[PDB]
Amino acid sequence: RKIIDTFAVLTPSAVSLDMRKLALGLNDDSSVGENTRLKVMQNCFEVS
Amino acid sequence: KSLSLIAAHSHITGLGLDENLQPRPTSEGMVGQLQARRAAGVILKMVQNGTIAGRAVLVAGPPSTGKTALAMGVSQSLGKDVPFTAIAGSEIFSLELSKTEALTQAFRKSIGIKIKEETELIEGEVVEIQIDRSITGGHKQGKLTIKTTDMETIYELGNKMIDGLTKEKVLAGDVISIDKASGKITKLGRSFARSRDYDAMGADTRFVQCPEGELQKRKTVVHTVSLHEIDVINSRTQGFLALFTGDTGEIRSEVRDQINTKVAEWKEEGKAEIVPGVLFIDEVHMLDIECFSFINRALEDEFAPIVMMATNRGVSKTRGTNYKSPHGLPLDLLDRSIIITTKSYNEQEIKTILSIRAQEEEVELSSDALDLLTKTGVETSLRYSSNLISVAQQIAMKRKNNTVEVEDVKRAYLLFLDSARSVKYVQENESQYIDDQGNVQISIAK
Amino acid sequence: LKSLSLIAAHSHITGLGLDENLQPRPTSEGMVGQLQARRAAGVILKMVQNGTIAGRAVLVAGPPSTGKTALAMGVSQSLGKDVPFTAIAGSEIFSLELSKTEALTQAFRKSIGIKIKEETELIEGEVVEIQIDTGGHKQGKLTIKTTDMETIYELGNKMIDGLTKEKVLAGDVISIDKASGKITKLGRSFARSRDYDAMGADTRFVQCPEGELQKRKTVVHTVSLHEIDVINSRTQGFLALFTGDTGEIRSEVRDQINTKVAEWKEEGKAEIVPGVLFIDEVHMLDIECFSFINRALEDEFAPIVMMATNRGVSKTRGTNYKSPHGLPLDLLDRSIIITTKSYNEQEIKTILSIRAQEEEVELSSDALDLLTKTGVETSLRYSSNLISVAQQIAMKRKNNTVEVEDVKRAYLLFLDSARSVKYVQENESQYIDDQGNVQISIA
Amino acid sequence: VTRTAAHTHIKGLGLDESGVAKRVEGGFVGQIEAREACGVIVDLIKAKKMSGRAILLAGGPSTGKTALALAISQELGPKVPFCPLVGSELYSVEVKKTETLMENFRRAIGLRIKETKEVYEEVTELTPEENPLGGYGKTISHVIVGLKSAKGTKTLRLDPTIYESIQREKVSIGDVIYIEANTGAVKRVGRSDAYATEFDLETEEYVPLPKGEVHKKKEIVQDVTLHDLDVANARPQGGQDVISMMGQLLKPKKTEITEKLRQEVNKVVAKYIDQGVAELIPGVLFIDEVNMLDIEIFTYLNKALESNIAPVVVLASNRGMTTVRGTEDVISPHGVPPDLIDRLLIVRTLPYDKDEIRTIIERRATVERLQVESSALDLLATMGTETSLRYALQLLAPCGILAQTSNRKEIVVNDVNEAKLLFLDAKRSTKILETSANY
Amino acid sequence: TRTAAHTHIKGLGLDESGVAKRVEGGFVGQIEAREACGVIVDLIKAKKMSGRAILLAGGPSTGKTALALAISQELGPKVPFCPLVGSELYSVEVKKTETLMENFRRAIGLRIKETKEVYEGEVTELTPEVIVGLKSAKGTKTLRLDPTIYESIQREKVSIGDVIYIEANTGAVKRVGRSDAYATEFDLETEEYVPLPKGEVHKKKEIVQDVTLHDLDVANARPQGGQDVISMMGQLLKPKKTEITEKLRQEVNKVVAKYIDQGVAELIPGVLFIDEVNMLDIEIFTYLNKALESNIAPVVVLASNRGMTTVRGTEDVISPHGVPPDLIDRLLIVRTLPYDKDEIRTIIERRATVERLQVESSALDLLATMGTETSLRYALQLLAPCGILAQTSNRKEIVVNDVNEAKLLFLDAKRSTKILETSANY
Numbered sequence A: 001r002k003i004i005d006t007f008a009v010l011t012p013s014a015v016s017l018d019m020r021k022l023a024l025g026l027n028d029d030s031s032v033g034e035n036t037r038l039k040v041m042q043n044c045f046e047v048s
Numbered sequence B: 001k002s003l004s005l006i007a008a009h010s011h012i013t014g015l016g017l018d019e020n021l022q023p024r025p026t027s028e029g030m031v032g033q034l035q036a037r038r039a040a041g042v043i044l045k046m047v048q049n050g051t052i053a054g055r056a057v058l059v060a061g062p063p064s065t066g067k068t069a070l071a072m073g074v075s076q077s078l079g080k081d082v083p084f085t086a087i088a089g090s091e092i093f094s095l096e097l098s099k100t101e102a103l104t105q106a107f108r109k110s111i112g113i114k115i116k117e118e119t120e121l122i123e124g125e126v127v128e129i130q131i132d133r134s135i136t137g138g139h140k141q142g143k144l145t146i147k148t149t150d151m152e153t154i155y156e157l158g159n160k161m162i163d164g165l166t167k168e169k170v171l172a173g174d175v176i177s178i179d180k181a182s183g184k185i186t187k188l189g190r191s192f193a194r195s196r197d198y199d200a201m202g203a204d205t206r207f208v209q210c211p212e213g214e215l216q217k218r219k220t221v222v223h224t225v226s227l228h229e230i231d232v233i234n235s236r237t238q239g240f241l242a243l244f245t246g247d248t249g250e251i252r253s254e255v256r257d258q259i260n261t262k263v264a265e266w267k268e269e270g271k272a273e274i275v276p277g278v279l280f281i282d283e284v285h286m287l288d289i290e291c292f293s294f295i296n297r298a299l300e301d302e303f304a305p306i307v308m309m310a311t312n313r314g315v316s317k318t319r320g321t322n323y324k325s326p327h328g329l330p331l332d333l334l335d336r337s338i339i340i341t342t343k344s345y346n347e348q349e350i351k352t353i354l355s356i357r358a359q360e361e362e363v364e365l366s367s368d369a370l371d372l373l374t375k376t377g378v379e380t381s382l383r384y385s386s387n388l389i390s391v392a393q394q395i396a397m398k399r400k401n402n403t404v405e406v407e408d409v410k411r412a413y414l415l416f417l418d419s420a421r422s423v424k425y426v427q428e429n430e431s432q433y434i435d436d437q438g439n440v441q442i443s444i445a446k
Numbered sequence C: 001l002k003s004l005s006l007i008a009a010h011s012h013i014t015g016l017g018l019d020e021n022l023q024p025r026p027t028s029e030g031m032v033g034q035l036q037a038r039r040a041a042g043v044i045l046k047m048v049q050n051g052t053i054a055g056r057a058v059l060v061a062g063p064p065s066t067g068k069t070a071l072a073m074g075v076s077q078s079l080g081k082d083v084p085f086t087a088i089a090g091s092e093i094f095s096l097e098l099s100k101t102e103a104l105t106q107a108f109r110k111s112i113g114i115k116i117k118e119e120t121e122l123i124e125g126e127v128v129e130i131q132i133d134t135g136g137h138k139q140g141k142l143t144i145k146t147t148d149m150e151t152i153y154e155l156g157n158k159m160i161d162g163l164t165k166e167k168v169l170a171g172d173v174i175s176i177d178k179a180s181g182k183i184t185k186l187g188r189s190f191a192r193s194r195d196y197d198a199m200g201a202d203t204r205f206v207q208c209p210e211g212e213l214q215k216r217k218t219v220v221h222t223v224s225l226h227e228i229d230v231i232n233s234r235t236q237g238f239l240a241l242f243t244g245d246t247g248e249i250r251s252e253v254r255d256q257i258n259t260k261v262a263e264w265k266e267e268g269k270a271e272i273v274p275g276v277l278f279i280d281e282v283h284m285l286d287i288e289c290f291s292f293i294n295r296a297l298e299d300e301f302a303p304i305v306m307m308a309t310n311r312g313v314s315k316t317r318g319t320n321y322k323s324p325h326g327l328p329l330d331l332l333d334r335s336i337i338i339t340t341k342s343y344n345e346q347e348i349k350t351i352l353s354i355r356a357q358e359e360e361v362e363l364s365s366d367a368l369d370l371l372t373k374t375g376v377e378t379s380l381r382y383s384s385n386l387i388s389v390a391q392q393i394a395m396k397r398k399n400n401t402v403e404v405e406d407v408k409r410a411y412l413l414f415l416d417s418a419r420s421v422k423y424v425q426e427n428e429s430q431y432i433d434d435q436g437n438v439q440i441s442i443a
Numbered sequence D: 001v002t003r004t005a006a007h008t009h010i011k012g013l014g015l016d017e018s019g020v021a022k023r024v025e026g027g028f029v030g031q032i033e034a035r036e037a038c039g040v041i042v043d044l045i046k047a048k049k050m051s052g053r054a055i056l057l058a059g060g061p062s063t064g065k066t067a068l069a070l071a072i073s074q075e076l077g078p079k080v081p082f083c084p085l086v087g088s089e090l091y092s093v094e095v096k097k098t099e100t101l102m103e104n105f106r107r108a109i110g111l112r113i114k115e116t117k118e119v120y121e122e123v124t125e126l127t128p129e130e131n132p133l134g135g136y137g138k139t140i141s142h143v144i145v146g147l148k149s150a151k152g153t154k155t156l157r158l159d160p161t162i163y164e165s166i167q168r169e170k171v172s173i174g175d176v177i178y179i180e181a182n183t184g185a186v187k188r189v190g191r192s193d194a195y196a197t198e199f200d201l202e203t204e205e206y207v208p209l210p211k212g213e214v215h216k217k218k219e220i221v222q223d224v225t226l227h228d229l230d231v232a233n234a235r236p237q238g239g240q241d242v243i244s245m246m247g248q249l250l251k252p253k254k255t256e257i258t259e260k261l262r263q264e265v266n267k268v269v270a271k272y273i274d275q276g277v278a279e280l281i282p283g284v285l286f287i288d289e290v291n292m293l294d295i296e297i298f299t300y301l302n303k304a305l306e307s308n309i310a311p312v313v314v315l316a317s318n319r320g321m322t323t324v325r326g327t328e329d330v331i332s333p334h335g336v337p338p339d340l341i342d343r344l345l346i347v348r349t350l351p352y353d354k355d356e357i358r359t360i361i362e363r364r365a366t367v368e369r370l371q372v373e374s375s376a377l378d379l380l381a382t383m384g385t386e387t388s389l390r391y392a393l394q395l396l397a398p399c400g401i402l403a404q405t406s407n408r409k410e411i412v413v414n415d416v417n418e419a420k421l422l423f424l425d426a427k428r429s430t431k432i433l434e435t436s437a438n439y
Numbered sequence E: 001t002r003t004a005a006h007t008h009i010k011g012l013g014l015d016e017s018g019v020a021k022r023v024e025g026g027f028v029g030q031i032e033a034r035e036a037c038g039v040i041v042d043l044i045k046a047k048k049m050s051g052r053a054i055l056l057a058g059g060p061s062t063g064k065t066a067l068a069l070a071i072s073q074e075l076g077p078k079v080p081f082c083p084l085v086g087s088e089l090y091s092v093e094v095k096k097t098e099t100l101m102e103n104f105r106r107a108i109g110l111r112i113k114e115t116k117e118v119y120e121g122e123v124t125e126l127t128p129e130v131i132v133g134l135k136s137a138k139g140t141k142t143l144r145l146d147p148t149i150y151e152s153i154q155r156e157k158v159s160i161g162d163v164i165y166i167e168a169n170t171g172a173v174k175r176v177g178r179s180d181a182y183a184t185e186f187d188l189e190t191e192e193y194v195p196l197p198k199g200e201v202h203k204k205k206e207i208v209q210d211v212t213l214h215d216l217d218v219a220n221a222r223p224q225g226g227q228d229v230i231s232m233m234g235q236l237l238k239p240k241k242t243e244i245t246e247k248l249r250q251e252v253n254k255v256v257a258k259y260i261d262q263g264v265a266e267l268i269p270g271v272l273f274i275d276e277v278n279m280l281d282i283e284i285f286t287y288l289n290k291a292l293e294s295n296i297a298p299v300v301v302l303a304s305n306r307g308m309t310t311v312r313g314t315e316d317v318i319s320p321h322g323v324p325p326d327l328i329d330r331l332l333i334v335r336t337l338p339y340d341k342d343e344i345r346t347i348i349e350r351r352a353t354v355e356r357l358q359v360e361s362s363a364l365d366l367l368a369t370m371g372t373e374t375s376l377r378y379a380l381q382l383l384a385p386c387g388i389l390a391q392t393s394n395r396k397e398i399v400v401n402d403v404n405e406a407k408l409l410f411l412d413a414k415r416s417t418k419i420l421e422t423s424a425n426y
């Protein structure tokens, strides 16, 4: 923790929104199956 | 839009030709080469016909003979609705797509299909968006008053489109280009009614686009896509990620076969439109024998877009083989294809091209500098003077006078060397720089 | 022809099953000659079947089309089943993700034979019909009604809440382990076939087994140890048995498995089964492969390899020097040689007739003798193709017999190699050299 | 809206039962011996009686090897499988090329399978309700579900799994389904038109009301090769948790097919054909530009031809006394080693003639729907006879372009000479490149 | 402090007419190279044209890379100089051409003004279904968490008494820590005590964080939301650089065009660098031959020097500087002359002054003699060793003994070669 805390200052420069939910498959609109989105967000809730 | 300030190749806009397929001596920048421009017009009529396939033509001859100018003129002269593939053959190698996969991707991208889809709309100022509860008798009493300038009308939501409006948080009064088979309602902003509202002072903050068309009308929307998008859709359930990032992943053959059948029957059913474009490639002498066999079979194939292939070098070594043949290509493909030779320029067309370059760069030249540039270019090459004009203009600013005078071109000539100057300078310094062995005699004395 | 197999160039030859005397016959199982070769092959096959001595080697030489691949296939057929045969060619070891050395090691690991036995226990016929007197499972005893014994089984903390596990209507045949095991459904009953019109994919109907319940069942498996290596390669290494992403198996797993098989053999739970290796045309292989095998073929588990090639004085791939047979002296020292001989007329005609029988093809005297002449001046394979093409001609000629007509039509319309070379040399004008020298011009 | 590329002018060999050819038929003119041999070979192929046959033909460029290949492919019909791919495609990246050659042999062999299936389909009514018979909470195992369809309604209950399938489809009372009873799952036709119009808008399709009686039954016949089965078995098809979605989102790569899978697929296909489900057909393999292959393939094929399931292959090399690509001293006719030619025979595909070439040009004019004059046709044919037919073939279309720009529908000597001037050939480039100061 | 052979150069020294002084800001002679560099500097300062490149040819220690650093430090901070060597273009997971275009896209600077806001406050409640009731110094507002960012909030162990720096536009959450208001919880509490942030929770600022073309390329190609769990999967599934194709290139061109036409943004060009193009193979030369024939390729400089040597990637292409003839014919040559005795004197003098070496007159002259006798670099590498030797041999100045000890200790290539022809073993 002491080796991971202080130096964490670097910030990646550019980010574009709506490019991660479009990649995981969880969203309000995707070509992948919709039978997982609820259980997938529950996993995200409680996946260590 | 299309941010590109200037280039040595941004000086031609649309080429120039006539209905007789005859060249224009000053055809919108590019000049001379009557055979080249007539052949360009012949190929233009060929591609407008859209009735032949598997044709390969070789732009032979010495380099600098307007070959890139010819390609650019053809590309800008054919017009829109026909995307091209103008990529040099050097970057065919990749760490994600094999040579066969890359060639197949190029070939399938060269041939396009337009698709007309009879999508719908519901346009009009939706002044209110009421979402009633899911009553048992009627599962959704959702009021929403879409009305254009022509009429006043109300509608009803079928318990599916409530979040379609507000997938992104928008309000009512938004022109909605709704699609029945989409589920993603697109809001165009704000809209107007034809009412004066209340009696006291008001009607403030209303200046937007008002709906103009009918409340509903069919739209046969046309979309143009290449085989790349369709194939990446076939390979993976999500295809936009690989279209953007670029990690398709060498899709398999039965996909291409089923797409072939599907496109054939779609054309037969009157739903799609075939657009058989033409592929452009460069540095064919550098191409390798496996690519030679690939194109050899492709030419004999029933589906093959026309080919614009050129070898700048003449009688050069054939890459991928142990033997050298004319054009860097063996006689098999050489006889299979057709040949158009290209010869060099005289000085006057260089002068005209440089004058066009100058007036494109909106610089007040003086004709003495132009004459010096013409002499320097004709002595060595066109590109020499094409850069000399710009550097002399820079020197013109550096001496605080707008006109490009003699001393600007003279300083440009003396400062930056020439190919003959460089070779003379290095052959007299055979023991001063790094050489074959790398022997550098830094020792000026002793 | 259990599988979709159609026909072989040598399908008549299935087994080097020499007689009890092992003295070769002028004709046997369709093969003719190879007398000393067949005797040595029988000796080698018996030595392999011994299953007590490892690290042997035999080399095969001679011009091709002499039944060498047929020889190996007949040896494999005479070895029977339960002995998987390593079908690997020379051009299969230069793989991308598998280096040649450990690829050969994997081939040997597949080549080994082993047997494994195991014993388990189950209960059969449990037509249960639970009925108890909510939750809690007060007085948790279940009726069990199979063909032999129909009683009530008492349960405990693990079953009174294990019967509420696998929630069923208790009108079906079920299995439980009397050795403290779980509950598994084997299907419903025929009375349950009619209750639902379209039974779900899970629901199948099987009769109550006609017998008792406590079944102590023994099972036997024949799985190569490399399969176990793939299984235990990762935490869940079951998907990789067929995909092929082994990944250059480390030697620590190899020696651990060797120790395990040794201790299980000493325990009697496992016993070995001999294996063979065979690759055709060993000459077109790297000198590194020969160097590796010359050491790896004397290990404790060293199945014999069926070396075979036909080249002459050439260079071992991976070197520069001239070598015997295109093979190193080290490999040409720790082995024994099998050689073939030029064909004679009698076996040529007999083999042609046997092939025609295998192809359901009738050959008369004139066609047989003419094709024997072709197969003696040329090789026999040309006549083996010509019998097929001539039978096609005949059945297009509204007859089944093959005679001078179809054979002569084939001879005119199919070219011999020597005359093909003569035609090439006399019409080189239309041909192309390395430098692309082609005379496209005609006039 | 048509495109003809050096073909579509050929539709068959044009033979008879007695091996009699036709001088001008099926887009083929001449080649009596080649047509006879091809007819005999295809007659042998149609019987499905053999496997692993091979043949090499010696034919120069433009002599008609590709035309013969296309004609023979069309002889067996669309249903007979074929996969003629370029000889330079063997050298792949993600899989060793011998494995690719095995994969192509697996693809080539064909088969015809079939299956009969039933299916039920809106929903008339609905009545949901077994006993736990123990400590279980309850036991739900039967629900009466309506089935409207069009021609008669037949409601029926089945295993509860069909009920959970009904909830999985999330279908209302006025919603039509399509439930194949073989699995008990749901295939969704969509919503219905009867209980529809509950609102003025609906993104979900109303969907036409199903037509016919509800207890639908049918049979399907599909011709599928084995490599599709292999690749389908290789990857997972279902799943609900993270592994399935990540694997499907993952991009599969070409791998090596194990021989144990070959044994398994042979066993299962034999079991299915023995029940009458599938019928057997062999395949056809063709490779062009074969002389560029290396000696290791040329010698592995020596044993690969002995494969008992390998279909008929056709071998095509155009060169002569050439060394196999990668051979220091293995020089052979057509770049194929003698130990390989000892397993097949030789055909001779020769170039064309004067009347033959002029008829070829005229027929290409016909398929290109352009009118050709006698003088221009004869000039094209003659200069093809001296140098090359393909020159005239590639000049036909631009000459038609010139004629159209001249507002005429025929080629005149002017058009052909203008195309000759504006478009050179190989021969004129054999004596012009040397005098080029700039390369 | 530390000095590594540079930082002595501090500009060309061009006057109002672009003419540099003789020895100013670390410079010696080479008026041709200085004048050509000044001309290129003026052309770049024009900021109108693009797609042109030059090479400067000179031997070792001729000031080529020195002039490159001079032009770099002359251009200034905002306009970037891109240094790259022929060994750099040999990448691992992507092809060399794509690497060259990545360098080209990141070369051009693009001043942009995008917007960021941050929610920062003390949490008051959380309502699972999401509420995060951030309480700042004067504001207490409750956002809604999307399920993904709700999970990220859950993993942040944030409870009553915690402040988080959760950005508004990116959305990622960075907890500030336990509230300083609840400092009376434990006299030795582990968590840091941070007070309630000033202003409203939804603090808004105007930022000038610019973007290079590669930056906004990786923004959508590989999204980097960061702290949220779904952002972790997004940056974990494809953490590397993917082969961006021309389609995304055109999409990016449209996006940057609309952003620059929004008005606040602007464009500035840049300079790229290549050293020793002689080692480059024919493939990259041929590809760049058709790549410079475009409208976007920015300015690059070449530094190479070879005689009649075969171009790498070929076997028969013999040309000066190891450059293929076509590239030479389409590229501008700048000449450099060998350094002279007086130039060597001044070079050693300045290199002693920067290294805080008060080398006296005769020592400087003798060092110049060695510089003129074997090589400039041989004399230059001895300034620090001779000073340290005199320091160990108790001499503030550098007597001839120190330089003789250096010349018998640290030999040059010529003396080692003289040794090498007389040896029983290599």
Ligand SMILES: Nc1ncnc2c1ncn2[C@@H]1O[C@H](COP(=O)(O)OP(=O)(O)O)[C@@H](O)[C@H]1O
Pocket (backbone or CB within 6 Å): B008, B009, B011, B029, B030, B031, B032, B033, B062, B063, B064, B065, B066, B067, B068, B069, B070, B312, B353
């Ligand atoms: N006829 C021409 N008219 C105008 N510009 C030309 C002409 N020929 C060449 N150029 C210029 O030269 C560049 C292309 O060089 P080019 O002569 O096509 O070389 P190559 O013939 O070897 O392809 C273009 O940027 C163009 O501006």
Ligand SMILES: Nc1ncnc2c1ncn2[C@@H]1O[C@H](COP(=O)(O)OP(=O)(O)O)[C@@H](O)[C@H]1O
Pocket (backbone or CB within 6 Å): C008, C009, C010, C011, C013, C030, C031, C032, C033, C063, C064, C065, C066, C067, C068, C069, C070, C071, C351, C354, C355, C380, D302, D303
């Ligand atoms: N003794 C024999 N009896 C019957 N047929 C034989 C005999 N010897 C050879 N043949 C035939 O000759 C062919 C020999 O081919 P083979 O030697 O296996 O090829 P390779 O030399 O490539 O291994 C077989 O197809 C077989 O039908």
Ligand SMILES: Nc1ncnc2c1ncn2[C@@H]1O[C@H](COP(=O)(O)OP(=O)(O)O)[C@@H](O)[C@H]1O
Pocket (backbone or CB within 6 Å): B300, D005, D006, D007, D009, D027, D028, D029, D030, D031, D059, D060, D061, D062, D063, D064, D065, D066, D067, D352, D360
């Ligand atoms: N005998 C023939 N009759 C009609 N057309 C032919 C004949 N031979 C060749 N052609 C035509 O010539 C064109 C080129 O033939 P090509 O495939 O190059 O022959 P090859 O495969 O021998 O090189 C083909 O499109 C084909 O239609």
Ligand SMILES: Nc1ncnc2c1ncn2[C@@H]1O[C@H](COP(=O)(O)OP(=O)(O)O)[C@@H](O)[C@H]1O
Pocket (backbone or CB within 6 Å): E005, E006, E008, E009, E026, E027, E028, E029, E058, E059, E060, E061, E062, E063, E064, E065, E066, E067, E347
């Ligand atoms: N004009 C100059 N003024 C000061 N130092 C210079 C000058 N030219 C070269 N040098 C020094 O000589 C060394 C070599 O110069 P550099 O341009 O980096 O490489 P090269 O000249 O060998 O291509 C550098 O370390 C630099 O400090």
Ligand SMILES: [Mg+2]
Pocket (backbone or CB within 6 Å): B064, B067, B068, B069
């Ligand atoms: Mg050019």
Ligand SMILES: [Mg+2]
Pocket (backbone or CB within 6 Å): B296, B297, B300, D288
């Ligand atoms: Mg071909």
Ligand SMILES: [Mg+2]
Pocket (backbone or CB within 6 Å): C064, C065, C068, C069, C280, D302, D303
């Ligand atoms: Mg063999």
Ligand SMILES: [Mg+2]
Pocket (backbone or CB within 6 Å): E061, E062, E063, E064, E065, E066, E067
């Ligand atoms: Mg330098």
